[PDB]
Design a protein around this ligand. Sequence first.
Ligand SMILES: OC[C@H]1O[C@@H](O[C@H]2[C@H](O)[C@@H](O)[C@H](O)O[C@@H]2CO)[C@H](O)[C@@H](O)[C@H]1O
Length: 138
Amino acid sequence: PLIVPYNLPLPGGVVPRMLITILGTVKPNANRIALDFQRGNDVAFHFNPRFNENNRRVIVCNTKLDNNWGREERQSVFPFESGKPFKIQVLVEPDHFKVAVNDAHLLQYNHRVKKLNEISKLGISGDIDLTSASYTMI
Ligand SMILES: OC[C@H]1O[C@@H](O[C@H]2[C@H](O)[C@@H](O)[C@H](O)O[C@@H]2CO)[C@H](O)[C@@H](O)[C@H]1O
């Protein structure tokens, strides 16, 4: 597998029609997963499944600018399970990131960071065994 935390370079940033696919397996008794699409030190799109926030499972999405987190967008639809293999697909579309998990649409996150071609790294972290991380233009 891959070593977690894992950094995937995104050469020349992202662009609509770029599809990023993450394959892995959630560890037993997982607490968190995170994808961090970064523009330098900023996080354009943080995607953060939390397995136990006040005994609830929730996905928290946000943006970090100049070391400040913005307004959280929360999704209670939670397709992950401790112990199970998953596929996360993040498709960049003109106005938003579109996320599907295990081939089912999960959420969209509107672009707050506008310079898409400067979002040049994806950090993958958390309680997973990471199998692959890649991208393709569709
Ligand atoms: O916003 C994403 C960001 O959240 C931090 O945790 C927040 C928490 O969600 C919020 O409810 C509380 O009031 O403040 C915390 C600190 O900002 C995470 O620590 C961070 O890793 C991101 O996930």
